Assembly symmetry: D3
Homo-oligomer: 309 residues x 6
């Protein structure tokens, strides 16, 4: 990665997570306050890890396409950093919604995520407004909120997740960076829970209990893991973090996918929402509605430091 250290874009999914999306304000301190956070970001992480070395603390910081150009007009721009274009299928739509800054905060204890987030609040006071804050949690043995283990397909063991999450020499000025895409999905849990397990397995493409992938013969072409694994060893590093307000019957998945090239993520989204071939849409979308969709660029630590100067 040209000797550039990436942010934690190939990290495992935390036990506790905070996703914050901010929009910038037009205040006369906005650029400076954002740059203060850029300058001090790795120090804030150092502080947490020094204080709580066993709590697996991590935070990543990303920038929206318009925000990047506003904040950093002379820094160039990653080749694929452009506002996400809505993908509208015959039935489902991957919406494109606002967001200038993304913070993805993970730790073994929620109190540490809060601590970091509170300092961001203080440092960015007047410079930002909240677009979304979602709190997530690890559910059992890495299950998505629909009760199936998620993440087994992430590159690991015989592949290096950094290879798939981090920009390389194909865009050398931004090597060590990453393209991260987020979507909030709201589930129809009543309809999902009405499906027998065997039908749920056909929707997902893996066995519910033991997480073993369905055989080609058993796996339908519109299974979630069939359509989202686009092939040709093109992969991203994904979470699907549960969030919920059960008292209101609200159950969701916060999708976050880090990629060396956004083209992979976008192809996955095309396969899901349009279908390959057209109409062969992700069956899981019959139970899941995308209500946000935003692309951010996550710079290498080296670049982040330069941004803060």
């Amino acid at each position: 990665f040209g000797g550039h250290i990436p942010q934690d874009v190939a990290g495992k999914q935390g036990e506790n997570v905070i996703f914050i999306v901010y929009n910038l304000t037009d205040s006369p301190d906005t650029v400076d306050k954002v740059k203060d956070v850029c300058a001090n970001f790795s120090a804030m992480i150092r502080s947490m890890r020094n204080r709580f070395p066993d709590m697996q603390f991590s935070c990543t910081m990303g920038f929206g396409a318009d925000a990047w150009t506003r904040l950093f007009p002379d820094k160039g721009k990653p080749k694929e950093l452009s506002t996400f274009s809505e993908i509208k299928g015959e039935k489902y739509t991957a919406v494109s919604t606002p967001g200038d800054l993304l913070f993805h905060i993970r730790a073994k204890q929620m109190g540490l995520c809060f601590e970091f987030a509170s300092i961001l609040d203080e440092k960015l006071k007047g410079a930002v407004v909240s677009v979304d804050e979602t709190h997530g949690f690890r559910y059992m043995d890495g299950k998505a909120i629909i009760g199936f283990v998620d993440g087994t397909e992430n590159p690991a063991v015989d592949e290096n997740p950094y290879h798939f999450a981090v920009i390389g020499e194909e865009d050398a000025d931004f090597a060590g960076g990453s393209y991260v895409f987020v979507q909030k999905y709201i589930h129809d849990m009543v309809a999902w829970n009405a499906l027998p397990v065997e039908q749920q397995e056909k929707v997902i493409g893996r066995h519910k209990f033991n997480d073993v992938e369905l055989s080609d013969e058993e796996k339908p072409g519109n299974a979630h893991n069939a359509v989202t694994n686009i092939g040709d060893d093109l992969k991203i590093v994904r979470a699907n973090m549960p969030f919920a307000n059960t008292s209101k019957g609200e159950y969701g998945t916060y999708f976050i996918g880090y990629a060396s090239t956004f083209s992979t993520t976008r192809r996955m989204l095309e396969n899901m929402f349009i279908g390959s071939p057209a109409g062969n849409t992700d069956r899981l979308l019959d139970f899941s509605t995308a209500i946000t969709g935003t692309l951010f660029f996550v710079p290498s630590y080296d670049l982040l430091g330069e941004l803060g100067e």
Copy 2:
């Protein structure tokens, strides 16, 4: 307690917490669905503790005053179970707000709280509407969100917390039960953080770093721990659980206090909001606004089972 096993009303504060307050609906299944939960409540707890014996899982279930009489007209009524009467001081008000059912869910992992809460959602579908759901977290070494350790005054070590949290033979028909009072407080963190530590210590009545109580000579009469410790060995078992949406600058404390007699809690509230003497109000209320206030009765497990029959 007349041989009655209490719910977990003298438990320590969890690492992760969900507070849910429901109102009952007028559906023709409402009483039956609530009774199903009553009947199966200890089984649901058994399941969690059997599956995750090291995760310190706990849930308590309580009933509002009006709800109790609606649901269980022939079961009698605890002597102090009456709708909380708002306490209006010259400056501050402890508001009285709605709530028919309370669930207080605690565990070492938020995913387990979610699991339990999702089953409550399913079992109570159509019988309830959400009044409030708040998610809390343990912050560092048991700090309240204002950065001071909280809970050291809870009866422990040389006193038995059950003695102070659980109804005894003074109301024998409900021995083993508890009166629980909840309040959501929203903090003015900007004003709080502007105070030097030494002034913050005078507001709280303990040292910030080492949690040592201020000496009588140093402790003001309007310190939080001066006014809320009402004396005569009358005590309750309290949490003040942090909650926050930092992206919106929202910082709060979810107060929950379990008592053998609500008269103690009410006297504490009088001391805080009216002052003893009048005007000697809790200085912490200059930085904290109560936005909910509700009393619930938490029956013994024995009684809970009878309620579900």
Copy 3:
């Protein structure tokens, strides 16, 4: 329990377990060697717990009916300590098989169970021959090897498991003791795994994923949890510990049930193997074959010490 301390008969199920059943030999040292173990049993447990206070070490020791009378002719005999009589149904049989001594060894690490067992081997050299040794393990979140959580029905939370596991003043000379019954079951995993989950749930009587008991309307009368919960608040404390040699396709459950009265266990077995009414047998027996069955008496520590004198 007449002031008698029971052995660990209401303990939770260990992470690692060793079940050993010995027969006595006719050697001229047999009684003395057994008495040496009786005399030193609580010391051996003290040693383990002193050395490894966080490893949840436990061992229980029990005696077969014939063995008890051979070893201890003048100590009287528990009222229900008689060789188990085989229960033969129209289709299934709960066999009665040999065993003079039972050791049930549990800990957070298998190495500690081994340590204790090796010392028993040394102390009993020449006095015993192995009838069976089975090693078990906790499987996920307390699942039985058939993939369903087991043990949720064990008395806990609003009931005291000692009340159900320990002999009381109804047999005062043996108060603090327990009746323990063991059975090895071999499963037909191929047939079991061929069942859809919804049919598996009807066999067990609980939901597979969330361990919620089936409703009366949904639960068949021959479900495992219907037939084994005999009613009238008559209960025992059970494990169903997984064991396996997967390379040979061997999958089993080692049943062990501690009871204040063996009559409860025997009634449960009648319900399973004969049926109540006759023919209403445990559906789980269509997938599980009992290959051992033995009753042992587990004395209080006080009595155990006397036995060793």
Copy 4:
């Protein structure tokens, strides 16, 4: 114990330990400062346990015989609280050395012991002078510094350690209290390490590897565990905590023994230093030299509170 809650006198041995012995000064604040600590002692423990609920924090506080009478002339005196009288054998002497206050501080982390001790330092400033401070540590699986597991003989499993550590109705005014005796031993490690293991086992009376007690036939009458187990079910609760400055070749054991009656401890000491019969001294004293010896009274929490009034 007359309804009196004892201090942690039957606690297990901590991972990290601080033993502090203070003498009182003649300052005109000495009694008041000591009483401040008495009054606030259980609060200081509450604070630690509230902040660090999983760190097994404990502290006990005891008073020397002369100090008790100086500080509390009108509180009466425990029947056996008298300055320890040196026990001089033909070869070895159990010395009697000064000490007015004892603090025995234990936790899973040394930093917590330090925290508590620093607050004691602050509260007692000018009122005390240090007689001894020793820091100890748990060594492997509860080994004493001579490489043998220690503490297995402590009452546990089939006996209640409080019964042996806590004063009962035989001295009702002080029920809930305890007699604690401390000795620092310095070892001749070079001589000890020169002994073959089999001879070391004869000195101790247990096997080195597996902690199994030697048989009567194998155990010499002067073995440490033979002479210190005085019989007739008279027992105390002991630690022998390792301490060392290896750079100076200094290896020691800090003995601390809590007893319901000091007469048991004193009889043990007679057996060790004089011998029963005379000359049958503890063989371990051939490798261990007592350099301190002091008796303290550890009051119940109830009494401690009264002392602080």
Copy 5:
């Protein structure tokens, strides 16, 4: 390693272990079923590590010499992959016994090893028969079952264990692979335990308590660690995992050694069984009998994937 990722051949020894050796059957599905496992092996590991990231799950898969040629006739063959030739000394024999597939499964919980093994059973049904299954456990602080710490000599700290366990460019077509040799040893524990510790130390070549290597002057030339450390910085990565059925008096060590070149392992075996010089055999073989001996090739993950195509 030519850019090839090795299997976990330099892993530490698990807390719980399963060793399975299978023979292939002559069924018309055998090759395909084995290839299915090859193709899905890294996915099965990904699943376990995704679900249980803190449980240190690992599995390695190896092939016997004859099996390799049967299954993969056109893949070439590692230079040293040939059926192990029995080493017969004047007194002891390192036997050569059957085995086509080896699975070495390790984790912090035995239930996870079982899970993985059960899926192998299902996937290989009809294609294999069990030759041996042995379950092992970590014993105390990494002790072998003879009570001495084992594994300290494994390359680590100032050497890289992969260098010694993994084939390099000397056999480039198989770089990233490993030669693994397994032997089951049965111990004469009665004879071993009859040896004084000082003689046991001379058999092993290290001190029993502190694991310090004997000095050259003290260490006999036939000590286990003298004869098995062949010199010239030629090393392998070894376990000696305890296994036992104590009820039958059966105590064993399951030897498993991973090597970049089998020539090192074979030289070690020559030193042990024949002696260097002849007759200078491993003294530990006077207490240990080899009852199996088989060589397997453990391919890199890259190659394993190709094998499964």
Copy 6:
């Protein structure tokens, strides 16, 4: 580092620590005994890590300037290995005090540090005399004993600590080595504790509660973190480990700093004790007195092995 593996000079700070400084004696075994430790050092570490893989055991070994030349006259000498020259300011002095060997021992349990240290004592018997032994502990969330988090400035996250701690090709014969400097500081805790928090923050240069660095506008030029961060990306890897004997009112910090070049450490010391500009001394020195100061060279493991030949 020329392919040389460094000792643990960029390790995190242990939970428990032992610092030992020895002087050599003039005995006729001194060189040989030191060389025995050199030869066996990595083996001793291997043993600890093999036995206790989860206890984060570490030890580093360093040599004083005079000692190096005495022991190893023909090995050359690191370019900056010269006896530390006392730095005397107008008010404060960084003293230079004796020491020939340094051992820095860290682990999650103090018993493991003791174990290692005891073996060093045995191996070095007669060859050394103790200059200092200090025991340290981690205090809360990595706080120095003055109650502020320390170590956040250590290179990490976006920098590699080895780059700053380890000698590179600028001194190729010693690449992989490190310069370590130790100082014992004694604090005036009474004066420190009398400072309001806001003044303490000005002395340190960070906020006490949240460890956030003071802004340039708020941070005085004589703040500890201003003067010790010398700039130009010149950094060392530091601990400031707490030690104390609270009973004597003794509170200290054991400074230890590992550096690729001692010139950085020395410049830091100049800034602290003399001031840059002169007189702009570290304000923390108004509360901290240096009582030792010694430089040691910590060789790579490769070189250490050669030294032991």
